[PDB]
């Protein structure tokens, strides 16, 4: 199965690649962030909604593949190869991890709507060559 | 953030530790009861369903568990301490994706309440002794 | 005080006499049983039934019971008169809690007067000597003769 | 499981741990008092009350306690290690038992409220320091 987590909602793995991988914050700061606004949701027994099942279903999955490098890297007594291993795994899982949850949590926060609107303007602003391209970037806020 | 991946469907750890270990399918033939019965469904842009969506990121976090392992095992060179960690992983994780795809594959099958029923008759079952219980174990089937 | 437990219930200890001890599971496939099926009610603070109450001092005496008997096993170091005394354990109390989970679990499953009727039924088979009574007991469970589920 | 044998009713071990262990009656004088009041109505075939289940089950379960520690002190070998059975015994299970007991049919008595204020009034009294401590320990009673 070539499944792709997005589109389920209306996005795609090539849409959020308009985001670079430097732009998404640290799982620990969207953890932190799911724990502060849907902590009740999450831990609710109720489909509230089908972001709310994906992010329980991700945090999951997070926390396995943590408990499995842990576990190896206990057992491992190579730090330089650990640390080889270690980046590997934040590199990759951690960086589509990071998508995948600042996709939901936006999606919560905002809106779908919202967050399509900003990958498609961010993908515009960073494309503008640097010498064309204004200072103020475009970003997701409840505010003017 | 202590989730439980199942409490939104009625279920729960203990309800499906109610069966023993060695009763849930390879995850190998789940896979492929999924590719066969829901492939068009999961590779959908549709919320199908609560259990679609679960079982799409399940789906997911089995081959990036997958994809870290054989990374791993290529990158070390020692297949003593590679069927440690392989066996390790099964025991551990394959046993929960066990559980998680059986679950949503035969709730999309069958139904979520005929599923519960069968987990509780089922440990009822195999813990009552053979000379007063049935003789002939439960089976989920849609033929009359 | 001459208590007994299924009085309360409906029952005896007369009617519960006949069932063997091959009849019913494990103490801790019980428990198990409980904690898979009641433990939102057994852990409620709800007087959810006479049952849930009942079970939920059957449950805390047993795990008082297995304290004490591990506790001296401890300080005990002849094996010999450990395994003894777990077999003493098991043999009278185990057997009694047992009968006591069984018929509170399965009253709160099936329903009280199906549980009693079980009971004379099976009581009149055991009864009966094994060249006169069929020889597949009397069955009580949630699923037909088929064990198919659809 | 993680039961609590007084959630049922409203109570739990943190409020019963306000009083201290030399406060609960011996369990021989708390089934005399449960003979004397109750008889009838622990020997009946009726849910007569919530109480009454638990204390039945409760004095059963002491009863087989019981057997088993006078068994196990009739195979052991010396009067030592015996009196430290009876002592971690006592302690112990005769220290549960006593509150259970002691709560049951002190509810079954007064009351349930009447029960859990005077909990909370033998916290405060316990906590109160000797100097501003009343002699006059709470007491439940009738009249």
Known sequence: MDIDP???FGA?????????????????DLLDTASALYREALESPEHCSPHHT???????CWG????????????????????????????NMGLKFR??????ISCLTF????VIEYLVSFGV????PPAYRPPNAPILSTLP
Chains 1, 2 share one sequence.
């Open 54 to 60: 994906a992010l329980r279903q991700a945090i999951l």
């Open 12 to 28: 795609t793995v090539e849409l959020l690649s308009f985001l670079p991988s430097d732009f998404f914050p640290s799982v620990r």
């Open 125 to 128: 602003w960073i494309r503008t």
């Open 99 to 104: 998508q995948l949850l600042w996709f939901h």
């Open 64 to 91: 396995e593949l943590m408990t499995l490098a842990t576990w190896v890297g206990v057992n491992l007594e190579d730090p330089a190869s650990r640390d080889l291993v270690v980046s590997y795994v934040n590199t």
């Open 111 to 114: 809106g779908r709507e919202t």
């Open 6 to 8: 997005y589109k389920e």
